[PDB]
Design a protein around this ligand. Structure first.
Ligand SMILES: CC(=O)N[C@H]1[C@H](O[C@H]2[C@H](O[C@H](C)C(=O)N[C@@H](C)C(=O)N[C@H](CCC(=O)N[C@@H](CCC[C@@H](N)C(=O)O)C(=O)N[C@H](C)C(=O)O)C(=O)O)[C@@H](NC(C)=O)[C@@H]3OC[C@H]2O3)O[C@H](CO)[C@@H](O)[C@@H]1O
Length: 170
């Protein structure tokens, strides 16, 4: 958990209104992407995250950056709203999941191996610390709402991960 880059490291602004507590442990984990450029340099990812918080607060009218966590192609996990806060990333699932978004656009390409592995470590970390249910269901954004997110190629990768839940075939 110390490997997680905190909000203060990307100069986050404090939420406009009191955030909503998320009832833990979460039953679902949604994987998304930002549909932005990707970068292997921490300085660039930090720029993207801070500009995204503004996009979400000022361009979208939301309370804070939408995701609970972000994964950069530099292999880092960045704190979004965190482990205990209801996100604004997946309509119909915000109150019962953690939203993890990969920084980039993965319609054809895949995030770096390190980014993919750190994301898996983040999931194990959450289960191990009790934030994520032991029998949690891992799902993708596109399975919940009409959207390319987290990108076709990344979606194909995720469905090969343990805990992947096929909402349609069930
Ligand atoms: C390549 C691609 O992914 N394109 C998609 C495109 O991707 C967008 C892209 O979207 C990415 C994939 C993304 O992460 N989108 C999420 C945040 C999104 O828009 N999610 C909404 C739900 C948002 C949400 O939960 N909002 C809360 C906001 C609540 C406000 C306040 N209470 C707060 O807590 O902040 C809400 O309404 N919650 C209520 C109360 C509830 O859950 O009951 C959804 O499921 O479609 C945006 N990038 C960023 C960083 O925001 C950007 O703007 C357009 C494009 O680039 O989205 C459109 C749909 O809008 C899709 O059709 C496209 O296929």
């Amino acid at each position: 958990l110390s490997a997680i880059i905190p909000r203060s490291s990307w100069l986050a602004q404090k939420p406009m209104d009191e955030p909503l507590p998320l009832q833990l442990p979460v039953k679902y984990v949604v994987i998304l992407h930002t549909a932005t450029e990707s970068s292997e340099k921490r300085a660039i990812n930090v720029r993207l995250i801070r500009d995204m918080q503004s996009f979400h607060i000022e361009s979208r009218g939301w309370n804070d950056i939408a995701y609970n966590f972000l994964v950069g192609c530099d292999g880092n996990i960045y704190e979004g709203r965190g482990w205990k806060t209801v996100g604004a990333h997946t309509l119909g699932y915000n109150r019962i999941s953690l939203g993890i978004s990969f920084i980039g656009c993965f319609m054809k390409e895949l995030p770096t191996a390190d980014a993919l592995n750190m994301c898996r470590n983040l999931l194990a970390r959450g289960v191990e610390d009790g934030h994520i249910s032991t029998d949690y269901r891992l799902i993708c954004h596109c399975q919940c709402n009409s959207t390319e997110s987290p990108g076709r190629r990344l979606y194909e990768e995720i469905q090969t991960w343990p805990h992947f839940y096929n909402i349609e075939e069930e």
